[PDB]
Design an enzyme around this catalytic site. Structure first.
Site, PDB file in Angstrom:
ATOM      1  N   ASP A   1      39.780  17.587  50.260  1.00 55.35           N
ATOM      2  CA  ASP A   1      39.636  18.083  51.627  1.00 55.35           C
ATOM      3  C   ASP A   1      38.197  18.457  51.928  1.00 55.35           C
ATOM      4  O   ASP A   1      37.429  18.746  51.015  1.00 55.35           O
ATOM      5  CB  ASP A   1      40.547  19.300  51.818  1.00 55.35           C
ATOM      6  CG  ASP A   1      42.023  18.909  51.802  1.00 55.35           C
ATOM      7  OD1 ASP A   1      42.334  17.677  51.840  1.00 55.35           O
ATOM      8  OD2 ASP A   1      42.875  19.808  51.695  1.00 55.35           O
TER       9      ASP A   1
HETATM   10 CL   LIG Z   1      41.941  18.763  47.822  1.00 52.01          CL
END
Ligand SMILES: [Cl-]
Length: 321
Positions: free
Chosen positions: A135
């Site tokens: 992320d």
């Molecule tokens: Cl992640």
């Protein structure tokens, strides 16, 4: 630009379809709008005659001929923290505020743009040799293939679950035991920012163990068998222990009773999921030699963990002096 030459006959049961709709069905290798542009630009023949009405209805049995033509991501000067590199792979320590691959909302500025700049021959490897994601605000280790053989082999190792990807995290709440979340993950039905556990999502397995207890928080290490989008964040949230600082799955910070000013301050300021890819272990895709790399816990989490640890230790005595 690439020359496109295509022929087919409309199937009988396509009777009544729009010309653009029928061509989309006969030639699914080409987007709907692309086909529409081809029609309007006089590039489609129907029974030896140019037909430029995308809305015009077919009858089935029409012979169609198309003669048309066609026409990527840019290298960007973005520094990368390279942990290890050899002929076949690169191991990077990704900072926060850095997206891995272009998508909606992030056309550029990504690790992929960075790789295209650092090593331009990587443009010949699928997805610039990126084989798993982190992320934007998750820090830590990623492995990247430099070559086509390396990429194919790393992808096989992932499918066979032969790569260990370990993370360290701080989660909200008191947790009693390590364990496993094995729950499939999908896009959230109504919240476009979210992923969600869902019976019709993709299968996903996360293992977790408790490193250290704090008063109303817990330090974890996790190992993934799959790498779905937001997998740790959503699995941890699902079992009611969302990650500290997670801006999507967490709620308002809840400090324990009698927390110091420094504790409250550090906790409120922590503005990303407390999540770090800390260890990677794999069989080298070329040499098959077993290798392991570590990324140190970043300063943000070090401070967070030390404050929570000092708090827990202090409140294991009646001490306030
Ligand atoms: Cl992640």
């Amino acid at each position: 630009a690439q020359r496109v030459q295509l022929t087919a006959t409309v199937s009988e049961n396509q009777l009544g379809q729009r010309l653009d709709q029928a061509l989309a069905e006969m030639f699914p290798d080409y987007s709907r709008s692309r086909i529409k542009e081809w029609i309007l630009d006089q590039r489609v023949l129907v029974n030896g005659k140019v037909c430029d009405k995308p809305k015009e209805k077919v009858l089935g049995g029409e012979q169609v001929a198309i003669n048309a033509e066609i026409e990527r991501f840019e290298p960007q000067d973005i520094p990368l923290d390279i942990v290890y590199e050899d002929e076949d792979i690169i191991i990077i320590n990704k900072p926060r505020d850095l997206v891995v691959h272009p998508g909606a909302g992030n056309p550029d500025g990504t690790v992929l743009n960075a790789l295209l700049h650092y090593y331009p021959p990587i443009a010949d490897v699928p997805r610039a040799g990126i084989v798993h994601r982190l992320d934007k605000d998750t820090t830590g280790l990623m492995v990247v293939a430099k070559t086509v053989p390396a990429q194919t082999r790393l992808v096989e190792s992932l499918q066979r679950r032969e790569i260990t990807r370990e993370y360290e995290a701080v989660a909200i709440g008191h947790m009693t035991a390590g364990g496993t979340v094995d729950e499939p993950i999908s896009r959230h039905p109504t919240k476009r920012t979210h992923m969600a556990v869902h019976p019709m999502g993709k299968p996903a397995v996360t293992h977790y163990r408790i490193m250290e207890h704090f008063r109303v928080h817990t330090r974890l290490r996790l190992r993934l068998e799959t790498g779905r989008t937001h997998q740790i964040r959503v699995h941890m949230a699902h079992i009611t222990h969302p990650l500290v600082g997670d801006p999507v799955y967490g709620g308002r910070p809840r400090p324990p009773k009698g927390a110091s000013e420094a504790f409250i301050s550090t906790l409120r300021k922590f503005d990303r999921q407390a999540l770090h890819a800390t260890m990677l272990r794999l069989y080298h895709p070329i040499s098959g030699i077993e290798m392991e790399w570590h990324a140190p816990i970043p300063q943000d989490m070090v401070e967070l963990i030390e404050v929570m640890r000092a708090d827990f230790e202090e409140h294991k005595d009646e001490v306030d002096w």
